Amino acid sequence: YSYTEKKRIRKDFGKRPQVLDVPYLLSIQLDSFQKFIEQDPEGQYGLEAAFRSVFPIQSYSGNSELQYVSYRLGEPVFDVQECQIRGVTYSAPLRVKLRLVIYEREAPEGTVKDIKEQEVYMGEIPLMTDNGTFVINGTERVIVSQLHRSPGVFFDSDKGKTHSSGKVLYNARIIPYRGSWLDFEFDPKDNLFVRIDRRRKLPATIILRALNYTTEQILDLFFEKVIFEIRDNKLQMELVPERLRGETASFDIEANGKVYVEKGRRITARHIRQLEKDDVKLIEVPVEYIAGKVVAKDYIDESTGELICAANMELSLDLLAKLSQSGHKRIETLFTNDLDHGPYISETLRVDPTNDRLSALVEIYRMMRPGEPPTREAAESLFENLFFSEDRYDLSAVGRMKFNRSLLREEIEGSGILSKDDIIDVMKKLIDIRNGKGEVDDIDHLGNRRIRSVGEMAENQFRVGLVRVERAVKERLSLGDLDTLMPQDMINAKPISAAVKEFFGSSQLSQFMDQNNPLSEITHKRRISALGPGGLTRERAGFEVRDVHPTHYGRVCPIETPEGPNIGLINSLSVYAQTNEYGFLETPYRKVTDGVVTDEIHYLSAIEEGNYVIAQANSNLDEEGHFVEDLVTCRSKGESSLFSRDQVDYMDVSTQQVVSVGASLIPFLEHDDANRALMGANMQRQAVPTLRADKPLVGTGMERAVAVDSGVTAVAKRGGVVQYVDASRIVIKVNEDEMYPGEAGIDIYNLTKYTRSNQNTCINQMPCVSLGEPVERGDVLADGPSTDLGELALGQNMRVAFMPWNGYNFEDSILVSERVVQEDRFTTIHIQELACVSRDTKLGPEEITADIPNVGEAALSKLDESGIVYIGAEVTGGDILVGKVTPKGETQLTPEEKLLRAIFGEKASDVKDSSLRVPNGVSGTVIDVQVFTRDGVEKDKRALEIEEMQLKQAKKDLSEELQILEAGLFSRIRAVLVAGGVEAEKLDKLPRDRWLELGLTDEEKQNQLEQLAEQYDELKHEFEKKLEAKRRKITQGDDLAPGVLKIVKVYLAVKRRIQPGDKMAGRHGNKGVISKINPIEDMPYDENGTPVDIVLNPLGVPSRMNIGQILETHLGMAAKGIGDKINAMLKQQQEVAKLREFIQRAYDLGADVRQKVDLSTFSDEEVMRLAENLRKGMPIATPVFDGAKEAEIKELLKLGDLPTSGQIRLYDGRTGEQFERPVTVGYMYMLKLNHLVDDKMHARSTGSYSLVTQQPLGGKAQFGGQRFGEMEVWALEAYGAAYTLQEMLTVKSDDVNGRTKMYKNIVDGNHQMEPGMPESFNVLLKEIRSLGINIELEDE
Amino acid sequence: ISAASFQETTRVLTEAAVAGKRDELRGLKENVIVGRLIPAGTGYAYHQDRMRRRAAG
Amino acid sequence: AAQIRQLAGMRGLMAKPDGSIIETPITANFREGLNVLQYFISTHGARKGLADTALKTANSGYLTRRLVDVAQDLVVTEDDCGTHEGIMMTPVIEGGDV
Amino acid sequence: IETINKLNRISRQMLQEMGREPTPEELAERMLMPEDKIRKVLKIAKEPISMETPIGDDEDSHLGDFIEDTTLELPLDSATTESLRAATHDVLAGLTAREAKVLRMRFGIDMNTDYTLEEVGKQFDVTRERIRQIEAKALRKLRHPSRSEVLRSFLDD
Amino acid sequence: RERMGHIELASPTAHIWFLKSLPSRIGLLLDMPLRDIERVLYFESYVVI
Amino acid sequence: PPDLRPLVPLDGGRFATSDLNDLYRRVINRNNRLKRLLDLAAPDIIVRNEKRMLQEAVDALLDNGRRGRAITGSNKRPLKSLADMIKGKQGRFRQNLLGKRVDYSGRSVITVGPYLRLHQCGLPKKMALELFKPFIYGKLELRGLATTIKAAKKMVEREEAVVWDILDEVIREHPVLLNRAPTLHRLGIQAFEPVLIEGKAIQLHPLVCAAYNADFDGDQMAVHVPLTLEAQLEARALMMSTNNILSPANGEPIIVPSQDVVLGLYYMTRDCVNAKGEGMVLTGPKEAERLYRSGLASLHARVKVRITEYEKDANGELVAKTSLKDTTVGRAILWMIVPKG
Ligand SMILES: [Sr+2]
Ligand SMILES: [Sr+2]
Ligand SMILES: [Sr+2]
Ligand SMILES: [Sr+2]
């Protein structure tokens, strides 16, 4: 165990040992983006794939081209922390090496006066953060992975509502990664048709004729050919024994006189023996049998030169007689039946109106472009650019791999463009399935479904940006001069930057980071959605894709998915699953070598699983190799059944591979229903961090894995001994083992303190380590918002008693004690941003000074020196933050107002109050203020004094980093100096700056001091570089929107506490609303007198079918059962060895488990520090499936002197009488999630109205009105209500004259409507009149 | 007025214009759109006062 | 009584994506620990049943909208209608049960 | 129009020659025009946005749906204007006969036209200088806290 | 919000609601298919009055 | 009219115009050109082509989705034509019923109200003060507490102690409608007389919760307030929950106890083999409460109790039959809850 783990040992109730540990949870995001910025030569991945595809751009219109060499990145403008403050997009400038090539017409390729440019600006691409996110405009955003159909070839059946009877069809679909769609389908008339780019139906032979295939060549490729012969006037045929089987012959089948099958005789199997043995090659056939058959080749008269019969034509009695007249020897036909061979291609040729290649190319052009008449040059150009051009059509690396995989090919490698042989092979396989021999692939199969992450989706958006540029490049090459207009001026950076920015913060799969909790931060990054571009919409593909497919097993989580309209489209990625080399989903497996099981780990794709027999993790193993039982529950090729030991090829790694991270933290998932585990995983993501995070008593073991991988918690890069601890800075001295020669061994860990999130929650990094503690790599140094010591801590746990109350737990409702409010356990910190923008108008520019003509000095007491409110001022809903004034002009005073001005004296000329005020409600206090100014600067005194604070703090932040790094550098120098020449007392007296000149005799240690002296000068050099850059950013004139002078943003930290209305939920789906905060007096208590914290309804368990919350309650009191006995000790102070025996007994319960905690060999200092952490209960881990047993919890309950049943007798606080039945009391992990009652409560009587329609609208001061829909109208129509709906339609809605006249009646005390014409119908009347249709109102 | 509420609007408005139709406002859905009292419940006794005076006047 | 069956006794039989019922039902109840294969089997009906519920409100809501638009313009006109004619009403008996 | 076309040609040049973006201070130097001219044209050159521009969709909403009307006065303010005229009428009634007629002409209260000091003198029997005396006399009695407690509440605006 | 204006057309232009909307209000009134009306309106062929 | 198709300056400074304005310009432009071409030499080819687009210009203005498809001058979208204003799922004809915004309306998360009556709901204090805003000003100048409207506005914003007293006076006897989404039947909107409770959450009666499809876990309800005497009466006489105890679908009552109430009466009425106190004679149903809450007898066990039941007479009501019944202790206490008739 590590030192960070030794302070808090979690008792694991697992049985199966961990073979493969949990990997990096955000590996999908980081590894994929590094492919985009990868400098890979030939390995086409990311940017290098995008540039080399288009470039070198050539133009033979003016004989000139532009070439590509390599690209540059690095040098970011602002840091990840600096981007969030001043609102800058975190991106690195892309500069590409480009050179213009000039050709002269004399030699094949003659270059004259070549000009090369080093760096050309091509916009800037957003870089991924240290965790796995992008900072766009200031806010942190995530790119969601896309789930789509894999490029290659698909085969679909579709046998639903078709034709009339229900004829089963077969469809072949060639889908590329970039290009046009190829569809081959059969129609109700049995014929085959081709669809180009999913449009009109063309005959299947039209695509072959365009590929230069004659009518003779089309029939040659697919069909078997029967050869008829003309010998001595009579007609004969070449015989094949396989052709005549089952079908009754109407003629006498004879060979050289001998008759085998005569008129009115059937052929079975006996006759296919007599003809084979007698060496029969030629038989006599009548004129009737040949007539009706389809010819294959053209046969002309060799004496005249005229066409008798062309390819694909019906034969008759007269046509066969002319063939003997001409003098022909051979006739070639086709062999087509009704079962295994059919004339699908043959019958389409007659339907096909085209004659040659040119005719076919025009028909394709007319389908794609039905407007302009085509020429031969235009028709040939379009077809070659469809599926044969490299710049237009591409299968990519994965497409050709899967394309050759289904068609059964030798090679997996190939070109992106489809060849002429590839198109025929897809057509050949489609006929095979129609005949019989052929299988239909599944669309829902994960072996046919790919994952488009971040780097792959950004590559396609960058490629189309280059397509937008290449049009302007090649056209201007022949347009102008090639002597002056050379390098940079040719390519513009505007089209590139616009295409990239509309993807990172505008696309459907690019949303805000759901940073409610570290779990929601991780799960959102590994979300897989099938709603991206080139995928599926909300109302498409039916419900088949939404359903769980057996391939999901250990790749996609079956339970964790949105329960809304998406259900199935958006899915969570499982723990151990990763992306392979071709984008397919794969899950690790234990390799079994026919007997013994080895720790060999193999990642297998969805296609690979349908071959091997996979054993379940539920089975027990003998020793560590082979199985115990002969009959083992296994799964193979989709289905799952029992198998022998020798047939087993693979096994599951762990019993956690099927469930994703979001639902992995759920304690007793086995005892929960799949419907409520679906909901319970979603409730954990909405959880809001409490003021003080507390460890979960009933955990799983993944709590520690979530905290580290989230990136919100500060982890040690190297480790060693902690030198100085602060609530902002944690510095560490390296253990010298991982310290490499060159620089000082001190790492600075700067902590983010109180920062605003996307969901307005607080982000805080509290220190954990004490001064003088040894830690290593991977050790947790600081905790985030919802994390405890090393582990995840979502929303704390309270005392839970399942008992009915006096109607305060009617339906899902949950009670709370006053102690929950008194002790800050559910107090949530919310940081809010409020912006004040001074704007330039046509009347006059706006000012932001403390000169309010209306209020003063009452609200101006909070506001300080002419501008904004002071830092750290407690303000309530109504106080003024930024004093904004706006010029209005005119201000015509009414006769009555003119008198009022003369009586008292009033000053309100042009100056109108429009100041930034606190939203109407209850708010906290001001934390920080920021003022952004125009490019003309014109600094305000308040804006100038804060920049003085920004400069001095940044000076100290950079100076303190140098001081510590210098201290550790010269301390390392002393270690080198002492070793060899002992001067422990001599060097201390000498000044430390004169240590650089001193050194040992020129050896290997002299080279060691060479790097130390170089780094000292390097640290002093980079300090000046960082300070110059820091001074520039503060004094920099902030660029903003036009018509804006100054933007002031005042941040407020609201400390809102828990109250009735807030949404509380468990981990198993048990959600509820808080009824009433009851005092500690009336709430139930134990025999010893311990009051219960929260009371939850017991009725919402058997119908809900979630037993996981009950077993969490039983183990909850059991967890504190050990903790209370540790709490009973130490206070009285018992012996350390006496305390040591009880703790050792606690970690070893139930005879045999798995987790072996060190047998009391911890040091006296470590045991006492551990017992302090275990004082408030014992952390118990229960795995996802192989967790704590039902009998094991009862055994742990007896350790802490508690009943095995879990039910204890309680006393009522109000009466004092006993509850006539024992109630189950324990500890369940409760969650105070998002969308609280403070944000949900809205109320309006009167306010602002919209412009186009005169109905209520919300924006400032008062909230928006509630919509009265047509479903609510039916209710009032069903009731005898008439005057209430009259109110809803006129005075409460659109009627202009109605609302104001009615409002005055309320104040006067009249309560009368007096309704008129609503503006909803008044606009409608003018809209019909403007069309040209007379509509008028007629009287009585 | 009642038809164009849920049916196709352009077909109804063209049919009403050619034929020269008159909507006397008797249906419940007809009076909700124009902003008048419903010929049902409380407004039913109100509606009978105007329908009776169409024959005489 | 159907909910108590799954928790204490036996969960029962589950369905396949095609619509057919699986050969071997889940023997384990919610009192004891369910298997990895058994829980993955039970998820199908959970993500199919709730998927039907997501569009159940849209389908029944359209059915409510449908029946209104045809019958909304109907109110009571007279106190009594002068016809002694109606519908014959008999207790519904299916086979041999009321 | 010629200046807008001139802006786009130099914007392509200065973006890649310098590195980042042309600022109004730097853009004005190459155009040979003052900063107040360039920063003015940039606002005029922008095309008016469409009314039915979708923002986020989801529940289906357009840009023209969220635009509020500033022309409409608040029903609370409309009741204030009615209450002010009713209060002043009771206030003018407390004045001694002729004191109400002068203020209703000097400020145009309840009358269509506003009258000047010279116009009252010739149509009130009294002299020109006296009008200034009785005007302040009428105001002083309404400056008193006991009489005008209702009028002091309208001073909040 | 209530006042309207007018545009005087130099040439008579047909209404789309009475022409394209099935089964044509102008077509049924004159007993003439839409293909014959459009070719005249669009300026391709003459029609006898 | 220009107001229906407006050019308004936005908050930023960039203008916002209707798609109708862009369509109208491309009608007048070729209309002015045709007036020019008819007097400045008229070749048939050009004149017929100018008349060709002018016909299309009106066509695109009236109904754009018929002959071709016009593209906006700056945006890549089909323009909202005159026909597109009326139809299109959400327009002007269809928003008269569905897309209707309403004043004097609130919204909050529902909570339980066991102490409340059937005609009572637990409406929030800060919500009711905001909703009945004009109702406060009306009964504040009338009382003589506030001088004018502006003085009454300052008293409400400052949250004065006297305003809370007047607020309760206006709310009393004033019904308030409560709406839940979605409304399938008419009982989705029911009127309730509000009782002021401090908090941001609205409390609902457990019995009427059976009428809605509501569960206290994260559901929200709309709070509508009637204004006129006619609106107040048709809320009490028709839309009140006490008046609507039965369902309109069937003769069976919709307001029926569930969950906690059923479990409470089930335990009270059920009998045990031999509980505390059995075989007593008991004087009235009042002595049954004397034994249980004191601690001498349990609710169960078959104990003889003296009861006085009143049956319905032919005319009503004189029948008063008293007899010894063999029930339990818990059954006798519940008889006191049961009415005489
Ligand atoms: Sr790990
Ligand atoms: Sr006189
Ligand atoms: Sr319910
Ligand atoms: Sr719900």
PDB file of C-alpha atoms in Angstrom, chain A residues 1273-1274 1277 1280-1283 1285-1286 1289-1290 1316-1318 1320-1321 1328 1333 1338 1340, chain B residues 1 13 17 22 28-29 31-38 40-43 46 50:
ATOM      1  CA  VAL A1273     -57.800  24.719 -23.347  1.00  0.00           C
ATOM      2  CA  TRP A1274     -59.647  21.371 -23.574  1.00  0.00           C
ATOM      3  CA  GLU A1277     -63.863  23.595 -22.484  1.00  0.00           C
ATOM      4  CA  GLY A1280     -68.210  25.152 -17.530  1.00  0.00           C
ATOM      5  CA  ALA A1281     -65.398  27.705 -17.678  1.00  0.00           C
ATOM      6  CA  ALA A1282     -65.757  30.504 -20.211  1.00  0.00           C
ATOM      7  CA  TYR A1283     -64.590  33.728 -18.564  1.00  0.00           C
ATOM      8  CA  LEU A1285     -60.330  31.159 -20.974  1.00  0.00           C
ATOM      9  CA  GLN A1286     -61.437  34.639 -22.032  1.00  0.00           C
ATOM     10  CA  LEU A1289     -56.651  34.590 -24.559  1.00  0.00           C
ATOM     11  CA  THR A1290     -57.092  38.381 -24.246  1.00  0.00           C
ATOM     12  CA  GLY A1316     -61.680  43.304 -27.267  1.00  0.00           C
ATOM     13  CA  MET A1317     -59.710  42.165 -30.309  1.00  0.00           C
ATOM     14  CA  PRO A1318     -56.590  40.113 -29.452  1.00  0.00           C
ATOM     15  CA  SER A1320     -53.056  37.211 -32.212  1.00  0.00           C
ATOM     16  CA  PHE A1321     -56.055  37.520 -34.561  1.00  0.00           C
ATOM     17  CA  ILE A1328     -54.766  37.265 -45.238  1.00  0.00           C
ATOM     18  CA  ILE A1333     -57.974  37.617 -50.243  1.00  0.00           C
ATOM     19  CA  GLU A1338     -69.792  41.526 -40.491  1.00  0.00           C
ATOM     20  CA  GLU A1340     -75.630  41.699 -36.745  1.00  0.00           C
TER      21      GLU A1340
ATOM     22  CA  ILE B   1     -61.755  29.237 -39.126  1.00  0.00           C
ATOM     23  CA  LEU B  13     -58.620  29.500 -47.330  1.00  0.00           C
ATOM     24  CA  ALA B  17     -62.663  32.463 -50.927  1.00  0.00           C
ATOM     25  CA  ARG B  22     -69.495  32.854 -43.900  1.00  0.00           C
ATOM     26  CA  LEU B  28     -66.113  26.169 -29.644  1.00  0.00           C
ATOM     27  CA  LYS B  29     -62.801  26.201 -31.540  1.00  0.00           C
ATOM     28  CA  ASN B  31     -64.480  31.441 -30.777  1.00  0.00           C
ATOM     29  CA  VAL B  32     -61.132  30.616 -29.110  1.00  0.00           C
ATOM     30  CA  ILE B  33     -59.175  31.898 -32.120  1.00  0.00           C
ATOM     31  CA  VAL B  34     -61.110  35.175 -32.526  1.00  0.00           C
ATOM     32  CA  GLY B  35     -61.047  35.857 -28.762  1.00  0.00           C
ATOM     33  CA  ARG B  36     -64.732  35.483 -27.905  1.00  0.00           C
ATOM     34  CA  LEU B  37     -66.714  33.645 -25.185  1.00  0.00           C
ATOM     35  CA  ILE B  38     -67.148  29.882 -25.612  1.00  0.00           C
ATOM     36  CA  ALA B  40     -70.368  26.245 -23.711  1.00  0.00           C
ATOM     37  CA  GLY B  41     -70.902  26.421 -19.948  1.00  0.00           C
ATOM     38  CA  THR B  42     -70.997  29.958 -18.589  1.00  0.00           C
ATOM     39  CA  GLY B  43     -70.883  31.510 -22.063  1.00  0.00           C
ATOM     40  CA  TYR B  46     -74.615  34.551 -23.067  1.00  0.00           C
ATOM     41  CA  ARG B  50     -77.441  36.946 -29.633  1.00  0.00           C
TER      42      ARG B  50
END
